[PDB]
Paper text:
The [name] family, with ZUP1 as its sole human member, has a modular architecture with a core catalytic domain highly active against the ubiquitin-derived peptide RLRGG, but not against ubiquitin itself. A hallmark of [name] proteins is a papain-fold catalytic core domain with the catalytic Cys–His–Asp triad and two conserved acidic residues recognizing the two C-terminal arginine residues of ubiquitin within the RLRGG motif. Except for the minimalistic Mug105 from S. pombe, all [name] family members contain a number of N-terminal ubiquitin-binding domains, which are dispensable for catalysis itself, but are required for chain cleavage. Biochemical and structural studies suggest that the acquisition of two family-specific proximal domains have changed the default K48 preference of the [name] family to the K63 preference observed in ZUP1 and its insect homolog.
While fruit flies lack a [name] protein, the red flour beetle [name] encodes a [name]-type DUB in which a 5th Zinc-finger appears to replace the MIU domain. To further investigate the increased activity of TcZUP and the basis for its K63 linkage selectivity, we reacted a catalytically active fragment TcZUP218–592 (excluding the first four ZF domains) with the activity-based probe Ubiquitin-PA and solved the crystal structure of the covalent adduct to a resolution of 2.0 Å. The catalytic core domain of TcZUP218–592 assumes a globular papain-like fold with a catalytic triad consisting of Cys-371, His-505 and Asp-526. Similar to human ZUP1, the insect protein has two helical protrusions: α1, which corresponds to the zUBD domain and contacts the Ile-44 patch of the bound distal (S1) ubiquitin, and the α2/3 helix-turn-helix region, which is positioned on the opposite side of the catalytic center and might interact with the proximal (S1′) ubiquitin, which is not present in the structure. The arrangement of zUBD, α2/3, and catalytic core is very similar to the human ZUP1 structure, with a RMSD of 1.3 Å over 304 residues. A major difference between the human and insect structures is the presence of an N-terminal MIU domain in ZUP1, which is replaced by an UBZ-like zinc finger in TcZUP. In the crystal structure of TcZUP, the UBZ folds back and contacts the S1-ubiquitin moiety, which is already bound by the zUBD domain. The zUBD surface that recognizes the Ile-44 patch of the outgoing (S1) ubiquitin is highly conserved between ZUP1 and TcZUP. The same is true for the recognition of the ubiquitin C terminus: Arg-72 and Arg-74 of ubiquitin form salt bridges with Asp-406 and Glu-428 of human ZUP1, and their corresponding residues Asp-426 and Glu-448 in TcZUP. Ser-528 of TcZUP might—despite its unusual position—help stabilize the tetrahedral reaction intermediate, while the corresponding Gly-514 in human ZUP1 lacks this ability.
Residue numbers in the entry:
A (entry chain B): 1 to 75
B (entry chain A): 223 to 257, 263 to 592
Write the structure that this text describes.
């Protein structure tokens, strides 16, 4: 199924995912597509930072959801 | 149904356990009553952009004027003070220099006097010198990374070798050699560094725009700026806890070894310290009588009035608690440190420093 990953600049990419994919897997797909190292990626959905070991299903992330991608450690 | 989802009305009695039931409910955040999903995306997008300042909205001068005026109407600042502060600001900003309004001087001798007489302290290992820069009217809420840059630059400028490199940022103008760049000037220098190819990855992350914004920065922008100015840094990534209860003993060990180079009298600058959402400056470390290590951490969120206590007639022994951080007080999941370690001495190394490189502790690469 398709979801979207959007950075805070508005750059939006689409990913092919499944509900049983882990967050770690999604960050790997982001790296495959955009070359962004997973250790720089902070994925946010519905006010939570998504944990690498959980699945999209755990977070109730359905088709056409947008995950927001925050990069690096800033403040 | 003893309990169902208050947003979508799903029967939660058949959930695998209470965690999964609660996790389903929380997936509707921020909705708490029966309420498209593209709307929640927009709201979250806007709230994250406002938090990180990634919408470019506002700037230092505007926030200064607004917050100083609010202080005037609140009875906190006289109209006379409004005029003096505004004039000082315009004058210093005309030269790209910080106006000095939020500085507290001579931090090292003041902290050393209190620390070395503290009863449980056996060793006090400090950077050579540092001034404290507090966030103020124009940058409160977002300026922390820049203020910490200012604190580090204030120390580096006392070293003639580093002063020679940093002074190049003035690009023709000839201010006093101890002048520290303003926040707006720092934003400009980072944009200039980006446009010459420094950290293309990072400039893209920040929308290729920093001047006249209130945008959060982090350790990589520190490295970008100093590398641009031909100063060699190291970026150390303490990417996960290394001790019990989520603590970072390996970060404290690293800082101890860093400052152990300070007892020889050679110049040692402070350290830039990042965690998620906020940055600070490590100015030193104490060894207490049981052997435990206590960081001395300057923080731009502390006011000049708080920092004035270290020079006071009283406020000393317990006032030091403001700077002290034990391992139990440093429980962010991740920290990054930027240390200045020397100078970039050739065009080859200069060009190579345009691709930022970090060190991971523990090593996982
Ligand atoms: Na702006
Ligand atoms: Na403290
Ligand atoms: Zn529901």
């Amino acid at each position: 199924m398709q979801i979207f990953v959007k950075t805070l600049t508005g750059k939006t990419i689409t990913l092919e995912v499944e509900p049983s994919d882990t967050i770690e897997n999604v960050k790997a797909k982001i790296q495959d597509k955009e070359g962004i190292p997973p250790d720089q990626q902070r994925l946010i959905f519905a006010g939570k930072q998504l944990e690498d070991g959980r699945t999209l299903s755990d977070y109730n992330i359905q088709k056409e959801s947008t995950l927001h991608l925050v990069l690096r450690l800033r403040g | 149904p003893t309990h169902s989802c208050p947003v979508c009305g799903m029967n939660l009695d058949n959930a695998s356990n209470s965690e999964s039931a609660a996790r389903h409910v929380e997936s509707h955040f921020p909705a708490t009553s029966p309420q498209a999903l593209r709307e929640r995306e927009q709201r979250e997008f806007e709230m994250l952009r406002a938090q990180y300042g990634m919408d470019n909205q506002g700037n230092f001068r505007e926030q200064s004027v607004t917050n100083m005026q609010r202080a005037v109407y609140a009875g906190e600042m006289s109209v006379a003070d409004y005029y003096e502060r505004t004039l000082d600001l315009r004058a210093a900003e005309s030269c790209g220099i910080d106006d000095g309004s939020s500085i507290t001087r001579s931090i090292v001798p003041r902290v050393r006097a209190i620390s070395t007489t503290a009863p449980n302290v056996v060793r006090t290992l400090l950077c050579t010198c540092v001034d404290h820069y507090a966030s103020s009217y124009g940058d409160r809420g977002w300026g922390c990374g820049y203020r910490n840059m200012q604190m580090l630059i204030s120390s580096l400028l006392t070293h003639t070798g580093y002063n020679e490199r940093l002074y190049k940022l003035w690009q023709g103008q000839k201010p006093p050699r101890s002048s520290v760049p303003s926040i707006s000037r720092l934003q400009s220098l980072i944009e200039q560094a980006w446009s010459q190819g420094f950290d293309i990855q990072g400039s893209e992350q920040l929308g290729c725009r920093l001047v006249n914004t209130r945008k959060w920065i982090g350790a990589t922008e520190v490295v970008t700026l100093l590398s641009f100015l031909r100063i060699k840094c190291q970026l150390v990534d303490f990417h996960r806890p290394t001790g019990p209860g989520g603590t970072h003993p390996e970060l404290f060990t690293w800082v101890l070894k860093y400052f152990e180079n300070s007892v020889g009298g050679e110049f040692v600058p402070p350290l830039y310290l990042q965690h998620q959402g906020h940055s600070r400056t490590i100015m030193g470390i104490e060894v207490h009588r049981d052997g435990s290590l206590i960081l001395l951490v300057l923080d731009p969120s502390h006011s000049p009035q708080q920092m004035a206590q270290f020079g006071d007639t009283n406020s000393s022994a317990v006032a030091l608690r403001l700077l002290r951080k034990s391992e139990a007080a440093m429980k962010a999941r991740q920290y990054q440190i930027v240390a200045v370690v020397g100078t970039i001495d050739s065009e080859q190394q200069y060009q190579q420093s345009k691709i930022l490189r970090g060190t991971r502790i523990p090593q996982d690469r």
